[PDB]
């Protein structure tokens, strides 16, 4: 458990980057 | 806890969505 309260907080943290990453490549591919 | 063990498969489920995303726009952007 002491690894899973940091286990959410690991995916949750890749998830903003992945969000940032995505909105900055969806800039870039998905651009309109 | 309970909803902690589901939060992590939640995180983990997004992430390949996210990932399974990224790996295409990186295959455009993030190209090698």
Do not use: P, S
Not at 13 to 30: P, Q, S
């Amino acid at each position: 458990m002491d690894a899973i309260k940091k286990k959410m907080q690991m995916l949750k943290l890749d998830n903003y980057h992945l969000e940032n990453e995505v909105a900055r490549l969806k800039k870039l591919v998905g651009e309109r």
